[PDB]
Write a protein that binds this ligand. Structure first.
Ligand SMILES: [N]C(=O)C1=[C][N+]([C]2O[C]([C]OP(=O)([O-])OP([O])(=O)O[C][C]3O[C](N4[C]=NC5=C4N=[C]N=C5[N])[C]([O])[C]3[O])[C]([O])[C]2[O])=[C][C]=C1N1=[C]C(I)=[C][N]1
Ligand SMILES: NC(=O)c1ccc[n+]([C@@H]2O[C@H](COP(=O)([O-])OP(=O)(O)OC[C@H]3O[C@@H](n4cnc5c(N)ncnc54)[C@H](O)[C@@H]3O)[C@@H](O)[C@H]2O)c1
Ligand SMILES: [Cl-]
Ligand SMILES: [Zn+2]
Ligand SMILES: [Zn+2]
Ligand SMILES: [Zn+2]
Ligand SMILES: [Zn+2]
Lengths: 374, 374
């Protein structure tokens, strides 16, 4: 019925920054060659989506955000070999074209086909598939999952287990993968090591889970919102610190707690002051600091190079180091194999139409993750 | 015989910053427990020594500098078990106490008994062994080799091959180990990779050799002194470029020549602008920039954290990641086995008394490594 036909549906369109989303009628064009048109089922709210709402992450507007989600293949374009209609899928905010220098490198995952470096708000072919009131609307990270239907490039979609509960598994689309992989793939936490995690939201907590799985002996959870400590400990944090209870700077408080500093620290928030704190609290001779939080546009850090000369390793990564099209699937399988659980991360489930309410909860600090359902 | 007695000898004293070295008679107190008094045979002139003179590295004056050396054990204090009088040895600017958190950690080498963090200008017990006209003289990195005799802690001296040519293996005491290990140990250069080395002094040329040993496919040597190019080439560089020949920033050139950037970048000069260019020239998603150059005191770098989120790795190291006491002897054995040659690095040989002429050669850019004989 719908195949090859333009689908009219509802989607949350952002026309301006610091404005609410508009649940409007938009026309979703049919998938071109090597493209897949997905029917969304569950979409989780990531702070990155909010970054555009706040102006911290610039991207052409009007836009349809969303990138953390799960859905079903409504139809595919010509040349599509990986997914067929009906297949359960997870759109990847970072592609794996498999042909660029990066994709060919065994330890890189930031494919050259991404729309993060220099945002165009289009699909890999430079064009858009969304329209609304005679106006073309921009995509976001080539996923735009805040819509009942969306078109994505084949190399940016991954087929998952047919029995996968799309309402939970949508987190593996971003939050869980990013945090967990940051600990296991990027930092490469060693068994018996000491770790520190700044920020305890959806991504932060999965970093706790990742350090735990890696065998970290001590995991120090850091957050100004005390309410997150309950979950942090439950997921594996050995202790919880709130920077506000101290008269002393956090990195100092941390170094005196761990005999000179932690082995691995992760900044999962997105502030310069906290990224400075994470670099400073990891032992000057053998510590590794992993930046996970997305920094506000055009801001810099002033660092003394002596901080690295002694032996510190400072790195960062997108998507927790997982090569998208391969990693996400295998992750779902592990979830199926009951290797881990995403239940503690989902605190609120709202109907798509109340997306604006979902962003409110994120700003009030009442929710870890909120899953908008279709 | 001089054991147990105060030795009187010549040493090069720096009384004030930015002033020539003054060759004076000093008294060298005999060694205490776990200390070794050494008779110097050959010393190399490293830019770090010059960093104190110029004022870029702060350390208490007046002082006896020098740290890349080779000599013979004159006598040992009570408790010493790792060396005996007559042994050929290399003092280590960074000790390997073997009992601290860092020494236990198999991946870090920056021992806690170092005098680089906050220089006391003493031995490990907190005292000095040099006197000059009543005035006690400060030590440097616990080694102070610009003297005919010096005393070092036992954990800062490595016993080497009895047949080692001391006028050659002194480079292994610092310059070579640092350069070669930065590539092989710290960056862990992968075979078939592309490398950029900024700075072609004795340390930077050892970084080049190390990249070649690692099997890099390309090694681009950068330096504003074209007279260094002939040696870089001979040592492994596939190409050499002079930033002054270009219209655009060196980082943009390097990225254009290597399909987006190198895989491994090395800053071996000690300047802020080059450490930045060095980070910027390694591929945003898979590059590793390694800081080897000692930056001028209290100077800060201003960086956009986004530069790291894409996948870049930024780190630094001392002594090229080698655990001093263990690594030096092994490296001397490799030298003995012809595994590598030091001849190209050693461009000048002058008697100790001509030390000022040696620093002048460095300043003019006419030398790579100048060795001083006693
Ligand atoms: N880390 C460690 O361990 C170390 C370090 N360090 C450092 O390094 C550097 C360098 O050294 P050297 O090699 O000796 O020096 P020289 O000879 O002077 O060389 C330099 C080079 O560079 C070049 N440049 C300049 N500028 C520039 C350039 N290029 C380009 N661009 C620019 N701008 C010149 O020409 C020459 O050639 C320094 O910094 C030092 O410091 C060393 C060693 C080691 N250590 C540490 C220690 I406490 C002691 N030692
Ligand atoms: N690299 C990536 O792949 C990637 C992926 C997804 C998200 N992110 C980024 O990760 C970061 C967090 O994502 P999330 O969705 O889990 O966010 P979130 O907003 O729900 O959680 C941020 C947490 O940090 C805490 N916090 C805020 N200011 C703090 C401070 N100054 N000190 C200590 N804690 C503070 C908040 O209480 C909250 O618990 C954001 O920057 C997001 O853009 C990065
Ligand atoms: Cl268009
Ligand atoms: Zn790719
Ligand atoms: Zn996300
Ligand atoms: Zn040196
Ligand atoms: Zn030690």
């Amino acid at each position: 019925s719908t195949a090859g036909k333009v689908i009219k549906c509802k989607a949350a369109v952002l026309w301006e920054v610091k404005k609410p989303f508009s649940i409007e009628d938009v026309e979703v064009a049919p998938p071109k060659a090597y493209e897949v048109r997905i029917k969304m089922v569950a979409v989780g709210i990531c702070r990155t989506d909010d970054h555009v709402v706040s102006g911290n992450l610039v991207t052409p507007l009007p836009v349809i955000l969303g990138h953390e989600a799960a859905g079903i293949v409504e139809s595919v374009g010509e040349g599509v070999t990986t997914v067929k209609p009906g297949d359960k899928v997870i759109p990847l905010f970072t592609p794996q074209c498999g042909k660029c220098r990066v994709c060919k490198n065994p330890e890189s995952n930031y494919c050259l086909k991404n729309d993060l470096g220099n945002p165009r708000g289009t699909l890999q072919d430079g064009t858009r598939r969304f329209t609304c009131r005679g106006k073309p609307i921009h995509h976001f990270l080539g996923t735009s999952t805040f819509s009942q239907y969306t078109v994505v490039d084949e190399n940016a979609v991954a087929k998952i287990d047919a029995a996968s509960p799309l309402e939970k598994v949508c987190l593996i689309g971003c939050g869980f993968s990013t945090g967990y992989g940051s600990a296991v793939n990027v930092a490469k936490v060693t068994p018996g090591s000491t770790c520190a995690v700044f920020g305890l939201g959806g991504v932060g907590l999965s970093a706790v889970m990742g350090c735990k799985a890696a065998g970290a002996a001590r995991i120090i959870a850091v957050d100004i919102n005390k309410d997150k400590f309950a979950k942090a400990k439950e997921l594996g944090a050995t202790e919880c610190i709130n920077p506000q209870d101290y008269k002393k700077p956090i990195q100092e408080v941390l170094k005196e707690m761990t005999d000179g500093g932690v082995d691995f620290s992760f900044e999962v928030i997105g502030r310069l002051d906290t990224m400075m704190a994470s670099l400073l609290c990891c032992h000057e001779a053998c510590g590794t600091s992993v930046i996970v939080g997305v920094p506000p546009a055009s801001q810099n850090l002033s660092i003394n190079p002596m901080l690295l000369l002694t032996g510190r390793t400072w790195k960062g990564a997108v998507y927790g180091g997982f090569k998208s099209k391969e990693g996400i699937p295998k992750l779902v399988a592990d979830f199926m194999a009951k290797k881990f659980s995403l239940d503690a991360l989902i605190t609120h489930v709202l109907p798509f139409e109340k997306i604006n309410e979902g962003f409110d909860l994120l700003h009030s600090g009442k929710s870890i993750r909120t899953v908008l359902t279709f």
